[PDB]
Amino acid sequence: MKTQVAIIGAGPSGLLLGQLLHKAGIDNVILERQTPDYVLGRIRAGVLEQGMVDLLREAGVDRRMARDGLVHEGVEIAFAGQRRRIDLKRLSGGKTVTVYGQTEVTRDLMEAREACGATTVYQAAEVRLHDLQGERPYVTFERDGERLRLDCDYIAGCDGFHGISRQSIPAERLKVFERVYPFGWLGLLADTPPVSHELIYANHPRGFALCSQRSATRSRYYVQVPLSEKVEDWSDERFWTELKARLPSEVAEKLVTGPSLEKSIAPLRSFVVEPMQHGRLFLAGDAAHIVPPTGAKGLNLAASDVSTLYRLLLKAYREGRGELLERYSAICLRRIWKAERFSWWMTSVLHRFPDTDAFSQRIQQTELEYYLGSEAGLATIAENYVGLPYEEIE
Amino acid sequence: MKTQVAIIGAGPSGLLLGQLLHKAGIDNVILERQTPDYVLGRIRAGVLEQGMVDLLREAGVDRRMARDGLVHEGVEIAFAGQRRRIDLKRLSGGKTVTVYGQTEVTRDLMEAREACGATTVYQAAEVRLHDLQGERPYVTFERDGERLRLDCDYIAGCDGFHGISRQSIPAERLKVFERVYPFGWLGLLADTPPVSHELIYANHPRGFALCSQRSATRSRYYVQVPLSEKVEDWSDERFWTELKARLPSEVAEKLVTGPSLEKSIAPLRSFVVEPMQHGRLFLAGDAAHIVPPTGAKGLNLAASDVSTLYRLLLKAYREGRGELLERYSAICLRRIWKAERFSWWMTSVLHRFPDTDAFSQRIQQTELEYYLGSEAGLATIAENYVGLPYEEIE
Numbered sequence: 195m196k197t198q199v200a201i202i203g204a205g206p207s208g209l210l211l212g213q214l215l216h217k218a219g220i221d222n223v224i225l226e227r228q229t230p231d232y233v234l235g236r237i238r239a240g241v242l243e244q245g246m247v248d249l250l251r252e253a254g255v256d257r258r259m260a261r262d263g264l265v266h267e268g269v270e271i272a273f274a275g276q277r278r279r280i281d282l283k284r285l286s287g288g289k290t291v292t293v294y295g296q297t298e299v300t301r302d303l304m305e306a307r308e309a310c311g312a313t314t315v316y317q318a319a320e321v322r323l324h325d326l327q328g329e330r331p332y333v334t335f336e337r338d339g340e341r342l343r344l345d346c347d348y349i350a351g352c353d354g355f356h357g358i359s360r361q362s363i364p365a366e367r368l369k370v371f372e373r374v375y376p377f378g379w380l381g382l383l384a385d386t387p388p389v390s391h392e393l394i395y396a397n398h399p400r401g402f403a404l405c406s407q408r409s410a411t412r413s414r415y416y417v418q419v420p421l422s423e424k425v426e427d428w429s430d431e432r433f434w435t436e437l438k439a440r441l442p443s444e445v446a447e448k449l450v451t452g453p454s455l456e457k458s459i460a461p462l463r464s465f466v467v468e469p470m471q472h473g474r475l476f477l478a479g480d481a482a483h484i485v486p487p488t489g490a491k492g493l494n495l496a497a498s499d500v501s502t503l504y505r506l507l508l509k510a511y512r513e514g515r516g517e518l519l520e521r522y523s524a525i526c527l528r529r530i531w532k533a534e535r536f537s538w539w540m541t542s543v544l545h546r547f548p549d550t551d552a553f554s555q556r557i558q559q560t561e562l563e564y565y566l567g568s569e570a571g572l573a574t575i576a577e578n579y580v581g582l583p584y585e586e587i588e
Numbered sequence: 589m590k591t592q593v594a595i596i597g598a599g600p601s602g603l604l605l606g607q608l609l610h611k612a613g614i615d616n617v618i619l620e621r622q623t624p625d626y627v628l629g630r631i632r633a634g635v636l637e638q639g640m641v642d643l644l645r646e647a648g649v650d651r652r653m654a655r656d657g658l659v660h661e662g663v664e665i666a667f668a669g670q671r672r673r674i675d676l677k678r679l680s681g682g683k684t685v686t687v688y689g690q691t692e693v694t695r696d697l698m699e700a701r702e703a704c705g706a707t708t709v710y711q712a713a714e715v716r717l718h719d720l721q722g723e724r725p726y727v728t729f730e731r732d733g734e735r736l737r738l739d740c741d742y743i744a745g746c747d748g749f750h751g752i753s754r755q756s757i758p759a760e761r762l763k764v765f766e767r768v769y770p771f772g773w774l775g776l777l778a779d780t781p782p783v784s785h786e787l788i789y790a791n792h793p794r795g796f797a798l799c800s801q802r803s804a805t806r807s808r809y810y811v812q813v814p815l816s817e818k819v820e821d822w823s824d825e826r827f828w829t830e831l832k833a834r835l836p837s838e839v840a841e842k843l844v845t846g847p848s849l850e851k852s853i854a855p856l857r858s859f860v861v862e863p864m865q866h867g868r869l870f871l872a873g874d875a876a877h878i879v880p881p882t883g884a885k886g887l888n889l890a891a892s893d894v895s896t897l898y899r900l901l902l903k904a905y906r907e908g909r910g911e912l913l914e915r916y917s918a919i920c921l922r923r924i925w926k927a928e929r930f931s932w933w934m935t936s937v938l939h940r941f942p943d944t945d946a947f948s949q950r951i952q953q954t955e956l957e958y959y960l961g962s963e964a965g966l967a968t969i970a971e972n973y974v975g976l977p978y979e980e981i982e
């Protein structure tokens with residue numbers, strides 16, 4: 195079996211990269227460990243930046259999003275009994291964010307790939323990478339018992355945080371930067387109309403809470419919870435009671451509750467590896483870095499890695515400029531670090547930490563009061579939230 | 589002995605408050621523990637905000653400052669081998685800062701007070717405060733053996749961090765917020781021309797360094813040093829060698845060194861007490877709060893406390909509106925907390941901390957890269973550095 199670019203992982207990163215590549219005439223094969231249905235069952239991202247929206251249009255898979263996605267011009271932050279709106283559109287110079295579920299984006303890409311007839315192997319078991327530094331690397335996997343070999347020119351690891359690609363790079367060649375937060379997010383998806391037309395991030399003494407949405411009739415809520423928690427300890431009603439307690443009274447009053455469609459706990463983490471490549475293997479998305487969800491950057495950062503990888507591969511194949519691929523990591527890491535900094539800042543100002551002294555609690559409150567009350571402060575939040583510009587390359 | 593307002597402490601706070609009060613016809617007596625010469629020997633602040641400059645003009649003591657003070661329109665921050673200038677004047681909407689030594693400001697006020705004939709008792713030993721909640725509080729002190737009593741209406745504690753006034757408030761009535769940093773600043777005053785026309789804050793792997801000045805022929809330099817250090821371990825040459833190592837090569841090359849006129853280690857601390865008053869006792873300046881020197885806010889915050897106290901006392905005496913004095917703390921604390929937040933931020937991004945992991949070191953560097961490269965980020969530094977506006981009252 196032979197292709198030009200082997201892609202490990204059929205989550206949004208691998209699918210978007212494969213679609214862009216296919217449209218440009220660069221043959222590619224995607225290998226996924228799970229089934230199509232499993233990938234589709236993952237409830238994740240809800241907020242997309244402009245850059246991600248444009249990339250989807252470039253890949254020609256934006257029809258449904260343009261029709262169903264909600265365009266938001268602001269977000270709200272509640273703390274110490276007050277709600278402050280950040281006018282993203284005004285303060286960022288006209289940019290906005292789009293609410294369109296990750297399951298939707300994934301469905302759209304999967305449908306697009308199937309129609310094009312591009313190769314996707316689901317349930318590709320025990321994927322292994324070989325000859326990463328050679329001229330001709332290859333991937334071995336198992337499909338119903340028999341070990342098959344796939345030859346390629348380049349391999350893009352889009353297999354997420356627990357994928358095989360990052361583990362395939364000699365450990366000594368990588369520098370890992372990581373921070374684990376002492377809390378996670380308990381999320382609940384409900385078929386109820388959202389409590390607000392815009393998102394509400396709330397810093398409350400009992401802990402962080404976030405009111406989000408998926409459509410006019412589907413909502414997504416999260417509450418900060420310690421790492422000791424098990425999802426089975428949280429009935430739907432306990433969640434609603436806890437959520438209501440962390441929100442301002444006028445918001446909790448008009449809250450329409452209902453049975454959960456999905457409920458899960460996501461641990462918060464910051465993680466970055468340098469470099470993001472090794473020989474003919476290039477990491478993209480969650481395979482290379484993780485951000486705590488507070489800044490809604492994860493999927494958006496994956497889009498820029500992919501945008502960068504696609505452009506460089508195009509240069510390599512169409513223009514014979516293969517040397518440009520060495521700049522991949524330098525280019526991506528500039529954007530990754532700034533988004534990591536923003537996500538870390540958002541996280542530290544909105545969550546309640548366990549070992550916090552009086553001075554720190556006051557500084558946290560003051561950070562909010564300052565940034566939400568200063569035009570310059572508001573602009574730093576807004577420009578970061580809508581997404582910093584992509585680097586053009588060369 | 590009787591007066592209207594008793595002032596404990598003849599440092600800049602007490603002197604400025606007494607001058608403003610005297611000019612408005614409110615009699616006041618200042619009690620100082622040390623001698624005039626001792627106070628004058630303290631090398632401290634070099635950077636003044638516009639608000640402090642205007643207050644000095646209001647007190648009619650700005651002749652020398654207007655002539656000798658240097659007006660700065662920008663400051664530089666060096667990190668990771670690059671120097672970035674923050675145009676304070678441009679980014680703050682036209683405000684600047686003035687470099688004029690604290691010893692100078694103090695000399696000017698002392699000369700002004702002596703000429704006016706206002707009462708100042710130096711070497712006032714063992715000052716004690718009594719009847720703080722009564723209608724007629726009083727102060728007892730010792731002048732050459734005999735205990736004297738001074739009756740007054742109000743007492744302003746301008747006695748600094750180690751003064752008696754804050755200790756005179758029942759501990760249970762106060763909330764203390766404090767953070768002690770694991771380092772101090774080793775400062776050196778030299779009669780040499782400064783290395784730059786504007787200040788240079790430097791984040792270096794070996795530690796923080798700051799290039800400041802007092803005039804065209806007098807410089808003030810600081811280097812971060814751990815708390816274990818004794819000033820006698822640092823000869824003038826060891827200081828210069830260490831300073832040069834922390835600065836960019838092109839700066840260290842043109843550095844004119846020389847013998848020290850003063851050398852001392854200042855420990856870094858953040859400290860705030862709430863409230864800042866008790867009965868007829870009002871705290872102002874270092875007596876109520878301390879900030880690490882990184883943001884050049886200490887003396888400037890004292891000026892706003894004083895400006896606020898003076899205005900309220902004026903209302904009380906001239907307009908019979910004594911009830912307004914209850915708002916003193918609420919008013920001051922709003923400004924104090926924002927300046928504390930700024931000083932803490934500046935400190936955390938410019939200094940090298942001992943127990944720092946790889947992720948944090950990267951976040952520190954990224955904080956700098958982001959704030960120094962974004963117009964919105966630069967504006968948050970600039971508006972805070974020049975000083976946030978004073979609240980007008982009522």
Ligand SMILES: Cc1cc2nc3c(=O)[nH]c(=O)nc-3n(C[C@H](O)[C@H](O)[C@H](O)COP(=O)(O)OP(=O)(O)OC[C@H]3O[C@@H](n4cnc5c(N)ncnc54)[C@H](O)[C@@H]3O)c2cc1C
Nearest residue numbers: 203205206207227238239240241353354479480492493494
């Ligand atoms: C609570 C939460 C909220 C979020 N909210 C947002 C938000 O609003 N906005 C935003 O920008 N981001 C958000 N994200 C982040 C976003 O969901 C992720 O960054 C995104 O899923 C990354 O996509 P990916 O394709 O890189 O990896 P993944 O989605 O993890 O997909 C990787 C794929 O690779 C496959 N795979 C793994 N190992 C192997 C293997 N060995 N062989 C073959 N295949 C393998 C997996 O099965 C999976 O399908 C959120 C995340 C969470 C958890």
Ligand SMILES: Cc1cc2nc3c(=O)[nH]c(=O)nc-3n(C[C@H](O)[C@H](O)[C@H](O)COP(=O)(O)OP(=O)(O)OC[C@H]3O[C@@H](n4cnc5c(N)ncnc54)[C@H](O)[C@@H]3O)c2cc1C
Nearest residue numbers: 597599600601621632633634635747748873874886887888
């Ligand atoms: C290294 C350093 C750099 C600084 N740089 C700057 C800068 O550039 N800009 C800026 O804004 N700020 C800066 N400052 C801060 C500034 O110097 C102080 O905030 C300022 O000195 C506060 O003045 P004050 O009058 O409140 O108190 P102080 O200057 O401490 O004076 C208080 C007085 O009260 C007296 N006293 C004490 N106890 C008693 C008692 N029991 N009875 C009677 N009298 C008593 C003392 O003897 C003293 O004279 C710096 C400080 C340091 C240490």
Ligand SMILES: [Br-]
Nearest residue numbers: 238295296297
């Ligand atoms: Br979703």
Ligand SMILES: [Br-]
Nearest residue numbers: 487490491492
């Ligand atoms: Br995220």
Ligand SMILES: [Br-]
Nearest residue numbers: 532533581582
């Ligand atoms: Br970004």
Ligand SMILES: [Br-]
Nearest residue numbers: 632689690691
């Ligand atoms: Br001085």
Ligand SMILES: [Br-]
Nearest residue numbers: 881884885886
């Ligand atoms: Br200071």
Ligand SMILES: [Br-]
Nearest residue numbers: 926927975976
């Ligand atoms: Br200020």
